[PDB]
Amino acid sequence: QSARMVAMKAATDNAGQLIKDLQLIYNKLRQAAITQEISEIVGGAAAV
Amino acid sequence: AKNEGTIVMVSDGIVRIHGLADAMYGEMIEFDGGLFGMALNLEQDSVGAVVLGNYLSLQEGQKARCTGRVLEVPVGPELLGRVVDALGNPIDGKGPIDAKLTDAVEKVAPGVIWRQSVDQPVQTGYKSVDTMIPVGRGQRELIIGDRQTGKTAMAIDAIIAQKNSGIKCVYVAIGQKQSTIANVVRKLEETGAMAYTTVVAAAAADPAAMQYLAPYSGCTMGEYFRDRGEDALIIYDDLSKQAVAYRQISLLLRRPPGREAYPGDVFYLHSRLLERASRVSAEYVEKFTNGAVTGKTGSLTALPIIETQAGDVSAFVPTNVISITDGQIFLETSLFNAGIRPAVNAGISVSRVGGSAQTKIIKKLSGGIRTALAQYRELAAFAQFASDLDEATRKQLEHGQRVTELMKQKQYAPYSIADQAVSVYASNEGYMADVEVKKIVDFDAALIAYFRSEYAPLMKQIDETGDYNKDIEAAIKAGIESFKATQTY
Amino acid sequence: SSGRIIQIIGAVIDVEFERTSVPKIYDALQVDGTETTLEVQQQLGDGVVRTIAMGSTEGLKRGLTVTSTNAPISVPVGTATLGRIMDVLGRPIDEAGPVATEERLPIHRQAPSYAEQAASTDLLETGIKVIDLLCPFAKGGKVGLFGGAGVGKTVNMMELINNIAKAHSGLSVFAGVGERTREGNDFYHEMKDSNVLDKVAMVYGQMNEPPGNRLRVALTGLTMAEYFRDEKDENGKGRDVLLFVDNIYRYTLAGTEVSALLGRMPSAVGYQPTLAEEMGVLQERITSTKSGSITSIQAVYVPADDLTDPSPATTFAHLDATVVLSRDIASSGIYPAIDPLDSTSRQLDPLVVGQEHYEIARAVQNVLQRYKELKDIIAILGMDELAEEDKLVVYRARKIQRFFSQPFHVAEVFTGAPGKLVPLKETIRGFKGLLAGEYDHIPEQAFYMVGGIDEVIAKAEKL
Amino acid sequence: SSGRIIQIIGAVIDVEFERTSVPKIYDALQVDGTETTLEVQQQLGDGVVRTIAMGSTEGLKRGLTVTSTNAPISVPVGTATLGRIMDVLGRPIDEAGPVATEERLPIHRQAPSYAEQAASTDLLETGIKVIDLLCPFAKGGKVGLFGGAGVGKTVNMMELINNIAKAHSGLSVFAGVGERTREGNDFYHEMKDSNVLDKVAMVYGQMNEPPGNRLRVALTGLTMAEYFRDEKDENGKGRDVLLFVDNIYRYTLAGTEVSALLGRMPSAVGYQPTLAEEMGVLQERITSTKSGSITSIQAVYVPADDLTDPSPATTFAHLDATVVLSRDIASSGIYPAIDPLDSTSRQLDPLVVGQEHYEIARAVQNVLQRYKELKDIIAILGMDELAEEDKLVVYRARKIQRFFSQPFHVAEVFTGAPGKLVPLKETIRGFKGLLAGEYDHIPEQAFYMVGGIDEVIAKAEKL
């Protein structure tokens, strides 16, 4: 039993690190998507 | 005059033309110097045209005239085993083609009253596609995947394995550099599969209009046999290149953009092309030929191709194509790199037509492998942890591994109905439970080779008839038992 | 009096008329010398109107003449359009002769007012057990079918219209546009196969046709359903009319395809400015009036496989029931395979359906969800756990899953035209008995391919 | 015949003309006032031509005058250019006197016909472990290197030049487009000291020039190689040719820079509407027809370090062999940074290379894919949980990833270690032994920057 506690606590810490990295990637992708949509809308509205 | 016009603007293959009052839509126009142009926009005071050719020798003030005849291509049975440009001009230099029928390129599909269901198969020579995702005559099936994942190899194998079937094949190449077209044509010639086929080529150096119009001309050439009671099969190397060419030729025409800069009429572009693949009824055949042909039905199957960017199947174009086609075959990079070739994803690939298309023995035998593969998809996550499970899951995982390892086959080696039948029967009846996970391919090859050599009279009966009966079951069992011993792999 | 085309781009055509005579919005014009009809979409001043083409473009050139009918596109309706196939404008395409009727109705009408709504929510009885238990249908509701991964949509609709054909007086309409053509052929031949092709009307729209034809199609199906509902017997009870629409996604896509060229800016992820309005104009006419009731069944495809896209976002705000079926369990052998847990309704309220029905449906849903979370693969040890605590849950889940199976008349294989429209009570009482546990002795395989709780009792007692 | 400048914006100048003498497309014009050569890119009616200026645009006003040469940009060809340095227009820039030849060829011509293509089958061996093992090359083909800034593309191009051109009998053409100048001078002097200058022609257009000069500088090297291919010895056989393009990405980036000023609508991520056609009209002329064989090597730049960008996505299908450079492996200190996955060649099949070669390559790729897939559970959970076979796969993948590293001849300065060369059979033997399992006990720290299986044994003993 004494091993399982440290095993799961290390697993939780690693999960925290991974979620932080994924959050960074998510923010970058979201900003890129918003920029692309706005650019497309403005370009289309210029055409009409 | 009402038929003579001048050129006002020339830019990047698009010509803005004055005059030409009685100019119809899509009607060929004749530039000086033997150049043919289309008409795609008719504004209040100027006409937009695209020049199919080399526009580099057109200037301002060069005259043009209206012909009054829509795009037409030469059709006939002379085009078999030949390589032509989008408009039907031979380019292999083997002499002129004299087919004696000219046909329009833009026509409508048959009505709903004239169509019929799909009851006959179309073999591809691949165990996975032939047992899991069957294709029948008249069906439209889409191959979708990522760069360098075996997408064309499958289509070329499909063309190669219709040697005895008696169905014509048509191949359309869009955007490919001419070296690959030459290589493909040479490979078709080597195996004797070129006698029944025609090739339409619009390479990367060719204008955007050629790559825009190639698939329609291919379909018009393929309809000739369907409307007369013989079958046909058309393959488009990559409608993605065609969509991009349409985007270029439209954006140059000042048409409003949209999602990903693709203008409107993008869904129409692929729908009106993929709707023409259907099976007609014998009454339609009889009426078209005025009684020359009786008691026969025509067909035209399609297998178009579309590529994805790192698995983004949710882009603008793949979703449209996925919504139109009956079935979808997915090729995965993480499967191709793992050695599983052809890399077919079983859990995302479906076919709507289903068992009706397959023969009796195939329809009877595919079920066991289907259910085994389906179950093996579920226990996948618990694969790094074999020790923590009951024996039932162990046996299921083993069987799933064996089945997924039998579905691996080499290129340019089509199997015959009897080969698939024997292999599937050997798998289902638990005759490969004693062999390790490796050497499965060797066992398959050795069994197939032995069965062709010693039980050839049966093999012929299975090939010609495709029936299932107790005698056939007994003979297959006896042969497999004989080979299981007294032989090496 | 007469006008002349001045600009042709795609299917969008600008025509110009004298200063006084300008056709109103949605009026239909005839182009002499061709089969083309023009529908007005916008006015642009100086006597110029944008129009879409009803028919196909047979080489129209600048300067062609056009006269005005001064009335919207009116479809001929009546009792003489029963068992025929007609195009968007009402011409037959089955080569069985012209339609001999005189009653014509415009396809552009306003929705029923506030004071004309029904004064109750009765539920339409159906022979399908699952749709009648865990997702009750509404006699005026507009249900939608998002079930994918299966061609059974046509087969399911065939069973439904056929049981309805017996259950409902008749006069049903099928407005299929932008559909799989061989599926439409299978529809037509199936209806002729069961000798029920009479009393039904069909309107088909081909994908190759210009957006003008691929549009204003459901409108025609809607107009035909209405002439029937308002019909009244000497008694005066109108008819419960049904309507089918194979694809609405194609309707929205045609709108999107023509919007840009009509002078309208892009919005959202690229859709047209007027999405909610264009869908509401259709969805607000499918209502249960005081006299008569129209119900609708529409197959809706979700692009990109998400429920966030604007088109399904505007679609989900109009429905009353959502039915999703998947091959994952259809593979087991249950022919009427519809995902029980996924299905949802705005009529499963305790008061409208009865307290007993509400509680029994909730209990069944809870049992199914419990079995789903406690899979025998979710628990690697498999069986031998929670004896009668979760084991009995597993057995009951198996029994209910098999009892979902229902033999049908259309499937002539292994079945002598059963056509079982099981009484709603019988299903409720059988499920009550199963929940109470009085069937724990019945063999599980006896519960498959069962017509009714009595039927299953006989099947168990024989062996 | 004399025109007046009308508008100057950036590098784009639009110029009027008389009505009957407008110059055609791609012709060249000369400004009388200063040294400038303009190239026609499009016609705009009313006898107005849009043009791109080749050179500086400072000091050019409106109302300047221009004459027309009525012929495209012609460059001198022949053997006179051997061992000389030339501008984009052919002017020498080595301060070694004029070039003595009247043979001029235009730089705008059509691509070879389909009928005269040729099949390339003879193999070519570089000496680099990973290229000669997983992505094999063949004489007369096409090769490409894809990477992002700072990963190793040039140091590999120069190494290939060292291992191939120096030891090959035949001419060579080197064109530099959109790259650093210091590298150009270093290359010129390095070739001079080795007394192999007289076999190489050179063209240089670098990042310091207006986009007009950076846009049409690859075509000049192309024309020179084209003449060197079709030329035949009198009563004698022809010779091989080689072509090196330093960066072809700048060729498209120049068009992207000047696209909007030409009046074209934007598309995708700010790219010009006509991209692939623009890439093809150049990438098709690099061909080995029935007359001669051209072996070209190009380096392709990956913007923002993603391969999904349209520019490196369109170009993937124009090459026979593709080698993809990875920044993660570079940051790991592994050199050269070539990704074993995502690197393919059209000459890896059992017939062309044999059986053992194919089996070795396939097993290597399989092992590396297995490890890459396994990485995630290691990331979350740890190492002890995996099966022992998976631990063995992990160790083998690490050793394989290291063994692909190799010191270079032109990279002694960076690291202070001498260059190395490995025969192909030694690569095959080493990888077969590694996958066999006989080198498991050898520490994985001995597989770094050493060439050949034996040197590894010696290094392992040295530790």
Ligand SMILES: Nc1ncnc2c1ncn2[C@@H]1O[C@H](COP(=O)(O)OP(=O)(O)OP(=O)(O)O)[C@@H](O)[C@H]1O
């Ligand atoms: N069944 C197979 N077994 C082994 N190798 C295969 C198999 N199928 C294809 N390959 C290999 O994969 C490559 C084929 O790639 P493919 O033809 O799909 O290229 P692509 O770029 O995706 O297609 P396109 O023709 O549209 O440009 C070749 O290297 C071929 O040897």
Ligand SMILES: Nc1ncnc2c1ncn2[C@@H]1O[C@H](COP(=O)(O)OP(=O)(O)O)[C@@H](O)[C@H]1O
């Ligand atoms: N094989 C190698 N060994 C050691 N260093 C290298 C190697 N390849 C590249 N480098 C280093 O990486 C840096 C970037 O590589 P280089 O090719 O010069 O630029 P880029 O990657 O932008 O083309 C250089 O400064 C060089 O010293």
Ligand SMILES: [Mg+2]
């Ligand atoms: Mg291909």
Ligand SMILES: [Mg+2]
């Ligand atoms: Mg760099």
